[PDB]
Design a protein around this ligand. Structure first.
Ligand code: P99
Ligand code: GLU
Ligand code: GLU
Ligand code: ZN
Ligand code: ZN
Ligand code: ZN
Ligand code: ZN
Lengths: 258, 258
């Protein structure tokens, strides 16, 4: 059976090839997770189809209904067999889906427009002139809502009540807002994405301060999928062989234009 | 039932307290893994006894007999219920034991005596005046014994054939060898241990170069153990509370004396 892979359009993980209208199926896409999907499928011995998550979301549970959206939702409700995307391993997600060992490390980080007078999360929390926000329906927002760490809870208190809204629906929207706002919007997003964007034209953003936490992305499968075990062994093999490092280099740094 | 925890004397993960005499059982020990064990035990709801691996090794499989030694062997042969130690997640181990998601990241690194004229692994490989080696029965030696990277394979060819032997039985022996060889021995070990030692008196070693790979330590249980699931959930939770970040600062940065 063709394994249905859910993923998300997020650079440089999955992107539309420039001539994708003349290509078919998996060939329409390129990027880190496209290359990785090919390798996981080869080492696990399955055929597969890449499908972009319909609602364009990573995955969170609605607080009132308790329905999961995004890629998590496609797995939970049986629409996809596997997710190969920059999907963060979290405890609440682990209650409903399974994750491989992580294939890439990351932490929450701060993106500013160059010259913004902020060097840290503590800096951000202590002022109001520069607004700051995070992506909707993702692990970064949930991180702040739940955190018991003084500085991060102070940030949550501000963000949840800030008007106009400081949350964005896609990473690209957040990045554009940073670039537009003349230094008055900072964006909280994962270090991997922050680092990619810093090396992309117009080279007008940068990552400041240390990461706020330390986690990783995992390949996710529905609970009790037969695929879980083989996928995990494939991730370990590819790490040890050096593939993951090679792919990071290909899509981040060899890709660099600043 | 009291859970038998296997671990290994390795700073700053598990150390006999200087002062101890009036202490018994688990109380004799201190360290990152000692603190982590107490947290895992509290979140999983079990009592436990810390035991130091009998053969003082992490664990490797004998090529001729296929018997596993070290902490891995203690799990495989049913001599302990769980290992809580800086035990590297590897493909060959995952075939015989289960690991939690990683609780700490590390990479292979180079330790020199300060002033040694080496800045990289490439430097080591291209010369012969300065000897170099690694720990026996651990993941670092296997890394080299398997690597296809030109520089690392060149290092392997040298190390496996060097006389006298460049391999050591314990990390402490490796560190002593660096300290007392006047810059003529360099030691390959994990970044975590290297960075700890660099901030300890006599402050005469340092980490040079970047890491050679990127991996993680996991909590290990015997295949199919009934502890596995609860332990993984606990590592997830401790990470998201930040407790793991807190213990890292306690045992690395608060321990600095240089
Ligand atoms: N390519 C790689 O080597 C990346 O793999 C790793 C790794 F080896 C270690 C870590 S430590 C950070 C926490 N480990 S986790 O991401 O599996 C996690 C996430 C949330 C709760 C508990 C544990 C990270 C990597 F990505
Ligand atoms: N990687 C995140 C999405 C990005 C973010 O939340 O910053 C997740 O899995 O939800
Ligand atoms: N962490 C290693 C031990 C130290 C080393 O090999 O450098 C292991 O689990 O085997
Ligand atoms: Zn391959
Ligand atoms: Zn004593
Ligand atoms: Zn606790
Ligand atoms: Zn033998």
């Amino acid at each position: 059976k063709t394994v249905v892979v859910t993923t998300i359009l997020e650079s440089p993980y999955v992107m539309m090839k420039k001539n994708h209208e003349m290509l078919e199926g998996n060939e329409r896409y390129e990027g880190y997770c496209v290359d990785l999907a090919a390798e996981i499928a080869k080492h696990c011995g399955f055929k597969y189809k890449l499908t972009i998550v319909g609602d364009g979301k990573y995955g969170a549970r609605d607080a009132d209904t308790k329905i999961w959206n995004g890629m998590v939702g496609e797995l939970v409700y049986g629409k996809a067999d596997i997710a190969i995307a920059p999907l963060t391993i979290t405890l609440v997600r682990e209650e409903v889906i399974d994750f491989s060992k992580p294939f890439m490390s990351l932490g929450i980080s701060i993106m500013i427009k160059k010259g913004t007078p902020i060097e840290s999360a503590e800096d951000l929390s202590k002022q109001t002139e520069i607004a700051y926000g995070t992506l909707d329906s993702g692990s970064t927002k949930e991180f702040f809502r739940r955190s018991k760490i003084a500085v991060f809870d102070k940030m949550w208190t501000y963000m949840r009540s800030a008007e106009p809204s400081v949350f964005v629906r896609t990473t690209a929207e957040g990045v554009a807002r940073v670039r537009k706002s003349k230094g008055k919007y900072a964006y909280l997003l994962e270090s991997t994405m922050n680092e990619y964007i810093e090396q992309r034209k117009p080279c007008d953003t940068m990552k400041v301060g240390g990461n706020l936490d330390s986690k990783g992305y995992g390949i996710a499968t529905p609970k009790g999928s037969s695929l879980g075990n083989a996928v995990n062994l494939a991730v370990l093999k590819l790490n040890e062989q050096g593939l993951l490092d090679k792919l990071k280099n290909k899509w981040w740094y060899d890709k660099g234009e600043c």
